[PDB]
Amino acid sequence: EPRAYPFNDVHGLTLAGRYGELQETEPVSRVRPPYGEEAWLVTRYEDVRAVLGDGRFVRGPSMTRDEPRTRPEMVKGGLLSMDPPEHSRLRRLVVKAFTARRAESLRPRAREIAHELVDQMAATGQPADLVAMFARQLPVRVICELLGVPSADHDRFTRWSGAFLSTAEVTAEEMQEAAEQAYAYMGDLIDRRRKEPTDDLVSALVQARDQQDSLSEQELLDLAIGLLVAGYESTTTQIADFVYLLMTRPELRRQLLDRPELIPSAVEELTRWVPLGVGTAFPRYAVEDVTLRGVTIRAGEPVLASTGAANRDQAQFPDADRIDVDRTPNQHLGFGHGVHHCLGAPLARVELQVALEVLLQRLPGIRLGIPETQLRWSEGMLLRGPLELPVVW
Ligand code: HEM
């Protein structure tokens, strides 16, 4: 009587029709995931936003619960597993340093890196793999600039970082060695910056103060690695998926070639429209019984608040399945909502705007080098995206 979940097919970006059916007839429903507990699934925009914003729905139990999910292992810890006040304290120190102004200051380096990537693509000739050569490269390098990794170390840091992608074909010991190298490198950079500060994010994190509070050595280290993992695969997949949409919907490419100033707006519309997750991750837990759409969620039960479905809710977004690059208003939940709202969103927006700007300007004719129906799609079971995007231009 729960439904098998996830509903989305991983081989594409289609939103399962089941979501809209539940938005209509069962907006709070039971689901059985592949691993972990059965959970409530919430699908209307209004309810999803309400759950993400509501004090009674917490993430701390994540640490001691068998979370509904699609893969056997649980990746636990980080900001997303904490609740106020502990969460509030760390996030306060991190945003003091990782400001939206800092994000914007990286646009020029981000463009430069994007151009370098496109150079390497042109150097090997059509078709090139846009995933391997651009999408998997740009977001990890930008994180290198953000943190303050010296230029000479970008290549190895990028190499270690790919072991963390859910699509990586590496043994656990291999991923483990990549992780210990990343941690040792990051701990050493943090110690350099303490004694000799620069303008980078690591320096600013080392010096963040909040009425006399500061980040501990371990906090600095976990937060820096945490930003890497939170900021890499997500942005990489979303770059791939936006370019895939650009290449397969000519009207979308034509609109942005004609009016490149629409790119920020298109980034928001695509973030709304693409149901990037396979399912919804990061169940919330009820701290007390809460009634939602006349169903009582009992204290202790997990709730999956689907932003994928929320973002395509006809009640909130006129003609919600239409991609409209000028869509206004566009109060989408693609970067989440409430205290855990994506802290790298300003940087994610910069990156996605730059990726589109630079590819469109360098390769206005970029298109698939194979037919659509032959694309291989990631089965990592966390995010949806193509494994390879061979492109011609
Ligand atoms: C297109 C790319 C991205 C998307 C779609 C995205 C989406 C999200 C979403 C939906 C959340 C909320 C998760 C939830 O509450 O369940 C989140 C949180 C978070 N994101 Fe992102 N994100 C992206 C890029 C980034 C980048 C580039 C960084 C860091 C530089 C980053 C760092 C974080 C962190 C640290 C959190 C946890 C915040 C907290 O718990 O306080 N993200 N992101």
Side-chain angles (χ1 to χ4, degrees), residues 1-48 50-179 181-210 213-371 373-393:
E1 193 279 320
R3 290 180 183 76
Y5 187 76
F7 307 143
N8 288 333
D9 182 321
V10 313
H11 315 278
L13 303 184
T14 309
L15 178 69
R18 183 73 71 223
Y19 286 111
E21 165 186 337
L22 301 167
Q23 290 167 329
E24 269 210 340
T25 65
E26 200 184 359
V28 189
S29 67
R30 294 300 277 178
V31 292
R32 188 203 335 105
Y35 299 93
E37 293 191 273
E38 302 188 353
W40 298 105
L41 170 80
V42 166
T43 56
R44 297 180 178 170
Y45 177 95
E46 169 185 17
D47 306 340
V48 164
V51 168
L52 296 170
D54 186 305
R56 298 161 294 179
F57 282 103
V58 291
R59 283 284 301 143
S62 67
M63 297 298 292
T64 51
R65 295 296 289 273
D66 189 18
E67 286 183 289
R69 72 190 184 275
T70 56
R71 300 176 59 114
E73 64 287 1
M74 246 157 90
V75 192
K76 322 206 105 162
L79 286 176
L80 213 7
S81 79
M82 299 176 71
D83 296 314
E86 302 77 13
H87 175 261
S88 315
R89 171 185 163 265
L90 281 176
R91 176 148 181 148
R92 230 163 26 246
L93 296 157
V94 181
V95 303
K96 261 182 200 274
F98 188 7
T99 63
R101 184 166 175 72
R102 186 182 293 280
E104 182 63 35
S105 65
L106 290 164
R107 183 171 318 260
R109 263 318 273 147
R111 278 164 174 147
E112 289 166 0
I113 300 163
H115 283 293
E116 292 164 32
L117 294 172
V118 168
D119 285 340
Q120 296 165 3
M121 286 168 73
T124 68
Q126 313 197 182
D129 180 9
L130 176 82
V131 169
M133 297 204 76
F134 188 95
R136 290 190 185 146
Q137 284 289 328
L138 172 70
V140 54
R141 284 169 196 283
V142 169
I143 279 157
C144 285
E145 297 289 348
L146 168 79
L147 289 172
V149 176
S151 180
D153 295 328
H154 290 190
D155 280 357
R156 59 187 171 127
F157 204 82
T158 293
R159 176 167 51 78
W160 304 328
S161 292
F164 311 144
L165 296 176
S166 71
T167 53
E169 325 265 41
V170 302
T171 59
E173 313 88 82
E174 216 167 356
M175 175 177 78
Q176 247 288 127
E177 307 165 18
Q181 289 293 144
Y183 276 99
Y185 185 92
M186 191 57 40
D188 287 344
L189 181 69
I190 287 163
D191 292 352
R192 319 251 277 179
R193 296 307 194 258
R194 188 178 289 92
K195 23 155 176 178
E196 190 171 358
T198 67
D199 56 347
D200 56 41
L201 180 55
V202 163
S203 315
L205 285 168
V206 152
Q207 52 217 188
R209 291 298 169 287
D210 192 74
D213 214 344
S214 56
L215 298 170
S216 77
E217 177 66 3
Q218 191 62 47
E219 289 167 337
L220 288 162
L221 183 45
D222 295 324
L223 290 165
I225 295 308
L227 294 183
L228 171 65
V229 305
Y232 181 10
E233 183 158 5
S234 52
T235 309
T236 287
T237 304
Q238 193 75 308
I239 290 170
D241 281 346
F242 288 10
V243 190
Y244 157 84
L245 290 168
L246 255 261
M247 288 183 299
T248 51
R249 289 161 185 247
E251 188 69 22
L252 166 57
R253 171 231 295 282
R254 187 207 63 89
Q255 272 167 260
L256 304 180
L257 288 179
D258 287 351
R259 291 182 66 197
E261 66 273 12
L262 287 172
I263 288 171
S265 189
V267 160
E268 302 301 313
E269 173 68 338
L270 293 169
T271 297
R272 178 200 69 85
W273 187 90
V274 174
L276 176 68
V278 182
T280 101
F282 320 114
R284 266 61 177 179
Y285 291 83
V287 313
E288 59 190 54
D289 300 359
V290 169
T291 293
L292 179 47
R293 298 295 174 192
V295 12
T296 303
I297 299 162
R298 306 231 160 241
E301 309 181 304
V303 181
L304 297 167
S306 176
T307 59
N311 282 348
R312 294 277 292 269
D313 183 348
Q314 295 296 166
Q316 177 69 195
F317 299 102
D319 202 1
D321 305 318
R322 153 173 200 199
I323 298 169
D324 171 359
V325 303
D326 219 1
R327 189 177 282 275
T328 298
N330 187 6
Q331 286 306 106
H332 72 82
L333 316 175
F335 287 118
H337 189 67
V339 299
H340 295 277
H341 181 273
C342 180
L343 81 64
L347 187 57
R349 297 173 151 114
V350 167
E351 297 185 73
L352 295 157
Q353 292 165 12
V354 164
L356 293 194
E357 173 211 316
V358 177
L359 295 162
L360 276 185
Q361 161 192 322
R362 292 289 292 285
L363 313 171
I366 188 181
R367 58 193 191 103
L368 294 168
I370 66 181
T373 63
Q374 292 189 30
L375 282 176
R376 310 197 309 120
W377 288 91
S378 157
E379 297 176 336
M381 308 309 291
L382 306 180
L383 308 180
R384 300 188 298 162
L387 276 187
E388 293 134 11
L389 264 180
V391 303
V392 299
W393 60 89

Short mmCIF file of all heavy atoms in Angstrom, two decimals, residues 21 34 60 67 70 86 89 117 120 143 181 183-184 217 225 228 253 266 285 294 325-327 337 339 362 374:
data_model
loop_
_atom_site.label_atom_id
_atom_site.label_comp_id
_atom_site.label_asym_id
_atom_site.label_seq_id
_atom_site.Cartn_x
_atom_site.Cartn_y
_atom_site.Cartn_z
N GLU A 21 -0.08 12.81 -10.41
CA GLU A 21 -1.21 12.05 -9.86
C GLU A 21 -1.34 12.17 -8.32
O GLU A 21 -2.43 12.41 -7.79
CB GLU A 21 -1.06 10.61 -10.31
CG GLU A 21 -1.91 9.57 -9.59
CD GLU A 21 -1.56 8.15 -10.06
OE1 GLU A 21 -1.01 8.00 -11.21
OE2 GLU A 21 -1.82 7.22 -9.28
N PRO A 34 14.24 1.55 -2.01
CA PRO A 34 15.01 0.33 -2.18
C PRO A 34 15.74 -0.09 -0.89
O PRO A 34 15.85 -1.29 -0.61
CB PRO A 34 16.03 0.72 -3.25
CG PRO A 34 15.43 1.83 -4.00
CD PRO A 34 14.66 2.62 -2.94
N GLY A 60 18.69 15.83 12.43
CA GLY A 60 19.60 15.20 13.40
C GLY A 60 19.39 13.67 13.49
O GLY A 60 20.36 12.89 13.48
N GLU A 67 17.82 5.64 6.79
CA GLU A 67 17.18 6.59 5.92
C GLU A 67 16.64 5.96 4.62
O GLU A 67 17.32 5.18 4.00
CB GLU A 67 18.17 7.71 5.57
CG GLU A 67 18.45 8.72 6.71
CD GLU A 67 19.38 9.84 6.25
OE1 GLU A 67 20.61 9.63 6.01
OE2 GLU A 67 18.85 10.91 6.08
N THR A 70 18.38 5.21 -2.14
CA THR A 70 18.48 4.31 -3.34
C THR A 70 19.74 3.47 -3.37
O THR A 70 19.85 2.56 -4.21
CB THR A 70 18.45 5.11 -4.63
OG1 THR A 70 19.53 6.06 -4.55
CG2 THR A 70 17.11 5.86 -4.77
N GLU A 86 23.23 23.81 16.78
CA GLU A 86 24.59 23.41 16.38
C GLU A 86 24.80 23.77 14.93
O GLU A 86 25.82 24.38 14.55
CB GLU A 86 24.92 21.89 16.63
CG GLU A 86 24.76 21.43 18.10
CD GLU A 86 23.25 21.23 18.51
OE1 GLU A 86 22.34 21.20 17.65
OE2 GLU A 86 22.97 21.11 19.73
N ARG A 89 25.15 27.70 14.46
CA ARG A 89 26.51 28.14 14.74
C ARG A 89 27.47 27.86 13.58
O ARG A 89 28.16 28.78 13.14
CB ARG A 89 27.04 27.51 16.03
CG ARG A 89 28.54 27.80 16.21
CD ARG A 89 29.20 27.09 17.45
NE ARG A 89 30.67 27.10 17.27
CZ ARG A 89 31.37 26.10 16.72
NH1 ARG A 89 30.74 24.97 16.35
NH2 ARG A 89 32.68 26.19 16.58
N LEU A 117 38.82 24.87 -20.80
CA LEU A 117 38.27 23.57 -21.04
C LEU A 117 37.87 23.41 -22.48
O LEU A 117 38.05 22.33 -23.03
CB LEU A 117 37.08 23.27 -20.11
CG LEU A 117 37.53 23.17 -18.66
CD1 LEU A 117 36.32 23.07 -17.71
CD2 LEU A 117 38.51 22.01 -18.48
N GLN A 120 40.74 22.63 -24.76
CA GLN A 120 41.11 21.23 -24.71
C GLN A 120 40.14 20.39 -25.52
O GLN A 120 40.57 19.49 -26.24
CB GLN A 120 41.21 20.77 -23.29
CG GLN A 120 42.31 21.48 -22.54
CD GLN A 120 42.21 21.32 -21.02
OE1 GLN A 120 41.33 20.61 -20.49
NE2 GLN A 120 43.11 21.97 -20.32
N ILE A 143 35.88 25.28 -7.36
CA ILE A 143 36.04 25.03 -5.94
C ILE A 143 37.51 25.14 -5.57
O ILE A 143 37.84 25.68 -4.52
CB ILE A 143 35.45 23.65 -5.50
CG1 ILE A 143 33.93 23.76 -5.30
CG2 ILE A 143 36.02 23.19 -4.12
CD1 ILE A 143 33.20 22.40 -5.42
N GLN A 181 44.22 11.54 0.82
CA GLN A 181 45.08 12.54 0.16
C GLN A 181 44.42 13.93 0.22
O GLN A 181 45.03 14.90 0.69
CB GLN A 181 45.34 12.15 -1.29
CG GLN A 181 46.26 10.96 -1.48
CD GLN A 181 47.71 11.24 -1.05
OE1 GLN A 181 48.38 10.36 -0.52
NE2 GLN A 181 48.19 12.45 -1.29
N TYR A 183 42.07 14.99 2.29
CA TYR A 183 42.09 15.44 3.69
C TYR A 183 43.47 15.94 4.14
O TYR A 183 43.58 17.04 4.66
CB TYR A 183 41.58 14.36 4.65
CG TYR A 183 40.07 14.31 4.79
CD1 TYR A 183 39.32 13.39 4.09
CD2 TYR A 183 39.40 15.19 5.64
CE1 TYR A 183 37.94 13.34 4.21
CE2 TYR A 183 38.02 15.15 5.77
CZ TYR A 183 37.30 14.22 5.05
OH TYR A 183 35.94 14.15 5.16
N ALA A 184 44.53 15.16 3.91
CA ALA A 184 45.88 15.63 4.27
C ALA A 184 46.25 16.94 3.53
O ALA A 184 46.73 17.90 4.15
CB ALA A 184 46.92 14.54 4.02
N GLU A 217 39.84 23.31 14.34
CA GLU A 217 40.69 22.71 13.32
C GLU A 217 39.93 21.63 12.52
O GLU A 217 39.97 21.59 11.27
CB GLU A 217 41.92 22.11 13.99
CG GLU A 217 42.85 21.39 13.03
CD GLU A 217 43.51 22.37 12.03
OE1 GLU A 217 43.26 23.61 12.17
OE2 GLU A 217 44.27 21.91 11.11
N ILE A 225 36.14 20.10 3.06
CA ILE A 225 35.85 18.89 2.27
C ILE A 225 34.34 18.80 1.97
O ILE A 225 33.95 18.38 0.87
CB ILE A 225 36.36 17.58 2.92
CG1 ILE A 225 37.91 17.53 3.01
CG2 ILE A 225 35.99 16.35 2.07
CD1 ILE A 225 38.64 17.83 1.68
N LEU A 228 33.40 20.85 -0.99
CA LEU A 228 33.83 20.15 -2.19
C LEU A 228 32.79 19.12 -2.62
O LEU A 228 32.38 19.08 -3.80
CB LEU A 228 35.15 19.45 -1.95
CG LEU A 228 35.60 18.48 -3.07
CD1 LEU A 228 35.89 19.24 -4.36
CD2 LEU A 228 36.84 17.69 -2.54
N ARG A 253 18.06 26.96 -27.37
CA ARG A 253 19.37 27.41 -27.77
C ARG A 253 19.28 28.74 -28.56
O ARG A 253 20.12 29.65 -28.40
CB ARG A 253 20.05 26.31 -28.60
CG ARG A 253 21.32 26.73 -29.23
CD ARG A 253 21.34 26.42 -30.74
NE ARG A 253 21.30 24.99 -30.95
CZ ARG A 253 22.34 24.19 -30.81
NH1 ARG A 253 23.55 24.67 -30.50
NH2 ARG A 253 22.18 22.89 -31.01
N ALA A 266 17.31 31.91 -17.42
CA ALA A 266 17.20 30.53 -17.97
C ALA A 266 17.77 29.51 -16.97
O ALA A 266 17.24 28.40 -16.83
CB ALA A 266 17.96 30.41 -19.30
N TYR A 285 12.56 14.41 9.80
CA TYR A 285 11.91 13.58 10.82
C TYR A 285 10.99 14.42 11.65
O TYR A 285 11.40 15.50 12.12
CB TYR A 285 12.96 12.89 11.72
CG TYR A 285 13.73 11.83 10.90
CD1 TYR A 285 14.83 12.20 10.08
CD2 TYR A 285 13.28 10.52 10.84
CE1 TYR A 285 15.50 11.26 9.30
CE2 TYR A 285 13.96 9.58 10.08
CZ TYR A 285 15.05 9.96 9.30
OH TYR A 285 15.67 8.99 8.51
N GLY A 294 -4.76 16.73 6.19
CA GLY A 294 -5.51 15.77 6.98
C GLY A 294 -4.87 14.41 7.25
O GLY A 294 -5.57 13.52 7.70
N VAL A 325 12.10 30.50 -20.49
CA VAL A 325 13.33 31.13 -19.95
C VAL A 325 13.15 32.48 -19.28
O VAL A 325 14.02 32.88 -18.52
CB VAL A 325 14.48 31.32 -20.98
CG1 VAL A 325 14.86 30.02 -21.60
CG2 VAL A 325 14.11 32.34 -22.03
N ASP A 326 12.03 33.16 -19.54
CA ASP A 326 11.72 34.47 -18.94
C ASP A 326 10.75 34.34 -17.77
O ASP A 326 10.22 35.33 -17.29
CB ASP A 326 11.03 35.35 -19.98
CG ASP A 326 11.48 36.81 -19.94
OD1 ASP A 326 12.35 37.23 -19.12
OD2 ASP A 326 10.92 37.53 -20.77
N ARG A 327 10.50 33.10 -17.31
CA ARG A 327 9.47 32.85 -16.31
C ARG A 327 9.62 33.80 -15.12
O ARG A 327 10.70 33.87 -14.54
CB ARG A 327 9.51 31.38 -15.81
CG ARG A 327 8.31 31.02 -14.93
CD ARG A 327 8.39 29.55 -14.54
NE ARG A 327 7.96 28.66 -15.63
CZ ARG A 327 6.68 28.33 -15.86
NH1 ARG A 327 5.71 28.84 -15.08
NH2 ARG A 327 6.36 27.50 -16.88
N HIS A 337 15.19 25.18 0.72
CA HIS A 337 14.35 26.10 1.47
C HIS A 337 14.55 25.92 2.95
O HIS A 337 14.76 24.81 3.39
CB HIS A 337 12.86 25.83 1.20
CG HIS A 337 11.95 26.89 1.76
ND1 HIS A 337 11.93 28.18 1.28
CD2 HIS A 337 11.07 26.85 2.79
CE1 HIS A 337 11.06 28.89 1.98
NE2 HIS A 337 10.52 28.10 2.90
N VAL A 339 16.45 26.56 6.75
CA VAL A 339 17.81 26.76 7.28
C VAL A 339 18.89 26.03 6.45
O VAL A 339 20.09 26.44 6.49
CB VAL A 339 17.91 26.33 8.78
CG1 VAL A 339 16.93 27.21 9.67
CG2 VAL A 339 17.66 24.81 8.97
N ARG A 362 31.48 30.19 -27.52
CA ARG A 362 32.54 29.48 -28.22
C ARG A 362 32.02 28.48 -29.26
O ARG A 362 32.69 28.27 -30.27
CB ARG A 362 33.43 28.74 -27.23
CG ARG A 362 34.25 29.64 -26.37
CD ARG A 362 35.36 30.30 -27.22
NE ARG A 362 36.36 29.33 -27.67
CZ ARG A 362 37.31 28.79 -26.88
NH1 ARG A 362 37.40 29.13 -25.60
NH2 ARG A 362 38.18 27.88 -27.36
N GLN A 374 20.56 7.03 -28.18
CA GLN A 374 21.76 6.21 -27.93
C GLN A 374 22.62 6.69 -26.76
O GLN A 374 23.67 6.11 -26.49
CB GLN A 374 22.65 6.17 -29.17
CG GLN A 374 22.05 5.43 -30.34
CD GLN A 374 23.07 5.25 -31.42
OE1 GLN A 374 24.28 5.17 -31.14
NE2 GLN A 374 22.61 5.21 -32.66
#
